[PDB]
From Swiss-Prot, chain A:
Role according to the record: DNA-dependent RNA polymerase (RNAP) catalyzes the transcription of DNA into RNA using the four ribonucleoside triphosphates as substrates. Resistance to the antibiotics salinamide A, salinamide B, rifampicin, streptolydigin, CBR703, myxopyronin, and lipiarmycin can result from mutations in this protein.
Assembly mode: The RNAP catalytic core consists of 2 alpha, 1 beta, 1 beta' and 1 omega subunit. When a sigma factor is associated with the core the holoenzyme is formed, which can initiate transcription. The rRNA transcription and antitermination complex (rrnTAC) consists of RNAP, NusA, NusB, NusE (rpsJ), NusG, SubB, ribosomal protein S4, DNA and precursor rRNA; S4 is more flexible than other subunits. In pull-down experiments interacts with CedA.
Ranges in coiled-coil conformation: none
Processing after translation: Acetylated on several lysine residues in the presence of glucose.
Entry's family note: Belongs to the RNA polymerase beta chain family.
Residues of the full protein shown: 1294 to 1341 of 1342
Applied value in biotechnology: Co-administration of salinamide and rifampicin or salinamide and myxopyronin suppresses the emergence of resistance to both antibiotics.
Gene: rpoB
Identification of the protein by name: DNA-directed RNA polymerase subunit beta
Swiss-Prot record, chain B:
Assigned EC number: 2.7.7.6
Lineage: Bacteria, Pseudomonadati, Pseudomonadota, Gammaproteobacteria, Enterobacterales
BP term (GO), one: bacterial-type flagellum-dependent cell motility
Primary gene name: rpoZ
GO cellular component: cytosol; cytosolic DNA-directed RNA polymerase complex; RNA polymerase complex; transcription elongation factor complex
Name of the molecule in the record: DNA-directed RNA polymerase subunit omega
Job of this protein: Promotes RNA polymerase (RNAP) assembly. Latches the N- and C-terminal regions of the beta' subunit thereby facilitating its interaction with the beta and alpha subunits. Part of the processive rRNA transcription and antitermination complex (rrnTAC). The complex forms an RNA-chaperone ring around the RNA exit tunnel of RNAP. It supports rapid transcription and antitermination of rRNA operons, cotranscriptional rRNA folding, and annealing of distal rRNA regions to allow correct ribosome biogenesis.
One Pfam family, short name: RNA_pol_Rpb6
Reactions listed under catalytic activity: RNA(n) + a ribonucleoside 5'-triphosphate = RNA(n+1) + diphosphate
Subunit structure as annotated in this protein's UniProt entry: The RNAP catalytic core consists of 2 alpha, 1 beta, 1 beta' and 1 omega subunit. When a sigma factor is associated with the core the holoenzyme is formed, which can initiate transcription. The rRNA transcription and antitermination complex (rrnTAC) consists of RNAP, NusA, NusB, NusE (rpsJ), NusG, SubB, ribosomal protein S4, DNA and precursor rRNA; S4 is more flexible than other subunits.
Enzymatic class: transferase
Family named by the database record: Belongs to the RNA polymerase subunit omega family.
Taxonomy, superkingdom: Bacteria
GO molecular function, a single term: DNA binding
NCBIfam families, per the entry: rpoZ
UniProtKB/Swiss-Prot annotation, chain E:
Cysteine-cysteine disulfides: none
Protein name in UniProt: DNA-directed RNA polymerase subunit beta'
Posttranslational modification: Acetylated on several lysine residues in the presence of glucose.
Species of provenance: Escherichia coli (strain K12)
Segment of the intact protein contained: 149 to 247 of 1407
Job description of the protein: DNA-dependent RNA polymerase (RNAP) catalyzes the transcription of DNA into RNA using the four ribonucleoside triphosphates as substrates. Resistance to the antibiotics salinamide A, salinamide B, rifampicin, streptolydigin, CBR703, myxopyronin, and lipiarmycin can result from mutations in this protein.
DNA sequence: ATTGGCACGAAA
DNA sequence: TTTCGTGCCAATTTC
């Protein structure tokens, strides 16, 4: 219901098809936060 | 219809496990080709799953046994 | 001023060091005396604090009735009563050097007034006066159960009533010494220190004084067993409530005021501090008629007690004097114990909710809470 | 209102990660529960504390 | 420091720097700005500093000095354990956020 | 405003 | 000299 762009469009398609299931994914604001922290000269990353 | 889930909770023993079992059965009845084990009376698959659990016809062990049996039948009849 | 009993039941005394006076009654000479009303079923119903040097009409265990005054004491006077009966002789007490002579204009009954080091002469700074109890033969009378001679020191601003050569007895006063809401809960959970914290005793044993007017007064505690004499630096203007040469226990009240939770944790343990915090919070909440279970306050206190300090490395890799997680210390010590080795030794630390939430092992949560720049 | 909100936010932050993750730890420690009595009135009986 | 009596972190001034130049010449090096700080950070050895600080901590007795040495040793060990370098705290390249 | 931690200076 | 008092500065305050 929020900033996860691909799941937004997957959920609508599933609901129209009568399948009430979701594939969550990653929010966009977390990626924005990672980029903003990297712009300060700090190396922050996801591992594994 | 449903107003309370107390009987299903006592059948399963947990609300957190009841939600998962009912979701599994409801998804079987909704997206899969399964048929309800109780007479559906203008009900949705979630309420049907809750009513099936309330009568002791559905639990985790039964679902696992049914899945194993279906997979074995599919693998045997594939050839 | 006096204790007024409400119901009928047996009377119980806890932590009592009392002596029989000349009149036959009982006078309590213990600081931590507690009076309880235990009925036939053995359940405590009323609890009161009996101050040092108080008069009891009824003894320990005697039956009492409702609406009966069992205890009575002077709230504005601090007795310096003795335990044995005999004549009083001054020692190291000289007029014009340590004391003064002030006679009442109207009443006419007064004696020498003991002065403090801030008022007496310099030569009196190295002199420690005392009053000694002697018999008709001049020998020192020993207090029963003890071997030390019975002489009592006198602090400053002490007003003597009986002159030299006057017979006294047990329980006689030689001298008189003159004296909520949401923010409360917030300060309780933040573990703030009060403005004038109550001073406790770090170590048990005999107590004594040190160098006077050394910027601040000095206190020395020498335990019964061979141990280092502790040093306390009580700043003046604070009313000390312990005489010289008195036995004290660790974690006991020396000065008066609110008691800091950190001191309670350091000197009494974890159950004491958790019950103190629970009692204070529930006292605040019960005034408004709010009912909350103790489970929630207990889990909050548990989350406050999440850090430990290593006092020596031992066979572990924890550097001495570092702050670490209590669970990590427990895991490491239980891993080393199974190998037959020796674990580390630690002391629990108490942190406020704001400080405890910033010391977590996850930097994402700490940066989410507040002070993002410092955490990052 | 603002002070209450700040207090509850701090309380949530300090204890958010505590979850029931077991059934028994085998410990023998505990707290001694006695009735809450102040002065001459019993503020809280033992039944509601245990 | 050079051959003279100048320390490795002594603060000078314009007049003092000119006097040092006219007296000692090129035997010593003095700088200002972040270049000087980067040179100071780059020329220090973490292991030797840790050992010297540990020895000085275990040599004498005090209360505040003990806490200060503990803090400094903690920071030095934190730098040693990770792959970070002290001179990386001086920026030579600046990241730019996506448009 | 309030509170806590750090530098600076003055006490024994 | 070492320890303690005192001024400076940062971080906090609902939805």
């Amino acid at each position: 219901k929020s900033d996860d762009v691909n799941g937004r469009t997957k959920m609508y398609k599933n609901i129209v098809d009568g399948n009430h299931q979701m594939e969550p994914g990653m929010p966009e604001s977390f990626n924005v936060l990672l980029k903003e922290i990297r712009s300060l000269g700090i190396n922050i990353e996801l591992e594994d | 219809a449903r107003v309370t889930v107390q009987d299903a909770v006592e059948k399963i023993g947990n609300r957190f496990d009841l939600v998962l079992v009912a979701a599994r059965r409801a998804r079987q009845m909704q997206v899969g080709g399964k048929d309800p084990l109780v007479p559906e009376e203008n009900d949705k698959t979630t309420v049907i799953a809750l009513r099936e659990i309330e009568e002791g016809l559905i639990n985790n062990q039964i679902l696992d046994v049914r899945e194993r049996q279906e997979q074995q039948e599919q693998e045997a009849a594939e050839l | 001023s006096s204790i007024q009993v409400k119901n009928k039941g047996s009377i119980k005394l806890s932590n009592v060091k009392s002596v029989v006076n000349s009149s036959g009654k009982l006078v309590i000479t213990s600081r931590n005396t507690e009076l309880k009303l235990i009925d036939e079923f053995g359940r405590t119903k009323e609890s009161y604090k009996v101050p040092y040097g108080a008069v009891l009409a009824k003894g320990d265990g005697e039956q009492v009735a409702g609406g009966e005054t069992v205890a009575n004491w002077d709230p504005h006077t601090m007795p310096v009563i003795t335990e044995v009966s005999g004549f009083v002789r001054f020692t190291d007490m000289i007029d014009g050097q340590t004391i003064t002579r002030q006679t009442d204009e109207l009443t006419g009954l007064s004696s020498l007034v003991v002065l403090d080091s801030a008022e007496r002469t310099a030569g009196g700074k190295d002199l420690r006066p005392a009053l000694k109890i002697v018999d008709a033969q001049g020998n020192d009378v020993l207090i029963p159960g003890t071997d030390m001679p019975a002489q009592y020191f006198l602090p400053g601003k002490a007003i003597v009533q009986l002159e030299d050569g006057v017979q006294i007895s047990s329980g006689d006063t030689l001298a008189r010494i003159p004296q909520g809401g949401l923010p409360r809960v917030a300060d309780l959970f933040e573990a703030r220190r009060p403005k004038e914290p109550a001073i406790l005793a770090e170590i048990s044993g005999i107590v004594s004084f040190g160098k006077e007017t050394k910027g601040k007064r000095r206190l020395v505690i020498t335990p019964v067993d061979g141990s280092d004499p502790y040093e306390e630096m009580i700043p003046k203007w604070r009313q000390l409530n312990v005489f010289e040469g008195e036995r004290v226990e660790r974690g006991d009240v020396i000065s008066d005021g609110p008691e800091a939770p950190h001191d309670i944790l350091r000197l009494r343990g974890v159950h004491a501090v958790t019950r103190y915090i629970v009692n204070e919070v529930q006292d605040v909440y019960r005034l408004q008629g709010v009912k909350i279970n103790d489970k929630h306050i207990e889990v909050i206190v548990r989350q406050m007690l999440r850090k430990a300090t290593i006092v020596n490395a031992g066979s572990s890799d924890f550097l001495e004097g570092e702050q670490v997680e209590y669970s990590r210390v427990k895991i490491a010590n239980r891993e080393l114990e199974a190998n037959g080795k020796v674990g580390a030794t630690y002391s629990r630390d108490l942190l406020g909710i704001t400080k405890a939430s910033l010391a977590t092992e996850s930097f994402i949560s700490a940066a989410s809470f507040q002070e993002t720049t410092r955490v990052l | 209102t603002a002070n209450s909100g700040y207090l509850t936010r701090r309380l949530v932050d300090v204890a958010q990660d505590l979850v029931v993750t077991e059934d028994d730890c085998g410990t023998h420690e505990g707290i001694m529960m006695t009735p809450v009595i102040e002065g001459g009135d019993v503020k809280e009986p033992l039944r509601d504390r245990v | 420091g050079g051959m003279t009596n100048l320390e490795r972190q002594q603060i000078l001034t314009e007049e003092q720097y000119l006097d040092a130049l006219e007296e000692f010449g090129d035997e010593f090096d003095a700088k200002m700005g972040a270049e000087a700080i980067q040179a100071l950070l780059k020329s220090m050895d973490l292991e030797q500093e840790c050992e010297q600080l540990r020895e000085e901590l275990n040599e004498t007795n005090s209360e505040t000095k003990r806490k200060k040495l503990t803090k400094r040793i903690k920071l030095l060990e934190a730098f040693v354990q990770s792959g970070n370098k002290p001179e990386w705290m001086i920026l030579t390249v600046l990241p730019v956020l996506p448009p």
